[PDB]
Amino acid sequence: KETAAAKFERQHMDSSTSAASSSNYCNQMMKSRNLTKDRCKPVNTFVHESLADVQAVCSQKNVACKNGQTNCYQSYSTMSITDCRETGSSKYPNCAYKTTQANKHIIVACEGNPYVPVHFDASV
C-alpha cells in the first residue's frame, strides 16, 4: 500500500505553487489529491515549499505533538501554507472548502529511516 511518507506528500505538499491564488484552490486540491474520495475530510493544510525543506524539519526543534507524542518537530522558519476548512455548504460528494493563505511555522511528526514527515500536526 501507499507508504506513510508518500501519503504525507499527497495530502500536504504543493511545491508547484508559491501560494493559493484563488478562493477555489482548496476545492480543486482536496479533490485532485483524492482527499474527498470516501468522505469530506474536514480540515487539511498544504505546504508551498520544496519537499527537501519540509523533510529537513525532522532535524529541527523537537516538541511534543498535540496528542502528547514526542516525535514532533517545529520548523525554525515560517513557511507558506494554505489552510482548507470545510464550509457550511459542503455535502458529500460535493465537498466544499474555505481557502486561507498564511505564513506560519509547521509542526510535523517524523518516523522511519530515512527519518521523514508522516503526519501534519499543527501550524503556529
DSSP three-state, residue 28: helix
Spell out the long-range contacts of 35-38 with Cβ–Cβ below 8 A and sequence spacing 24 or more.
Answer: 35/11, 36/92, 36/93, 36/95
Q: Which residues are annotated as a binding site?
A: 7, 10, 41-45, 66, 85
The technique by which this structure was obtained is X-ray
* Rg (the chain; Cα; Å): 14
CB 87 within 8 A of CB 72: no
Catalytic residue flag (residue 48): no
Phi-psi label, residue 94: left if phi above 0, alpha if psi -120 to 50, beta otherwise? beta
The span from the CA of 15 to the CA of 72, in Å, is 22
Cα separation, 93 vs 82, whole angstroms: 22
- Which residues have a Cβ under 8 Å from the Cβ of 109 and sit 6 or more positions away? 65, 69, 71, 72, 73, 117, 118, 119, 121
Q: Are 84 and 44 in contact (CB under 8 A)?
A: yes
Which three cell numbers, joined as nine digits, stand for 23? 478562493
DSSP 105-121: -EEEEEETTTTEEEEEE
3-state SS assignment for residue 98? strand
Active-site hit among 8, 9, 11, 12: 12
Domains and CATH numbers, the chain: 1-124 (3.10.130.10)
Annotated binding site for substrate: 7, 10, 41-45, 66, 85
Name the catalytic one among 58, 84, 118, 119. Answer: 119
119 is known as an active-site residue: yes
**Cell numbers found for residue 36:** 474527498
Please give the Cα distance from 120 to 25 (Å, whole number): 19
Q: Apex CA 96: angle with CA 65 and CA 32, to 5°? A: 80
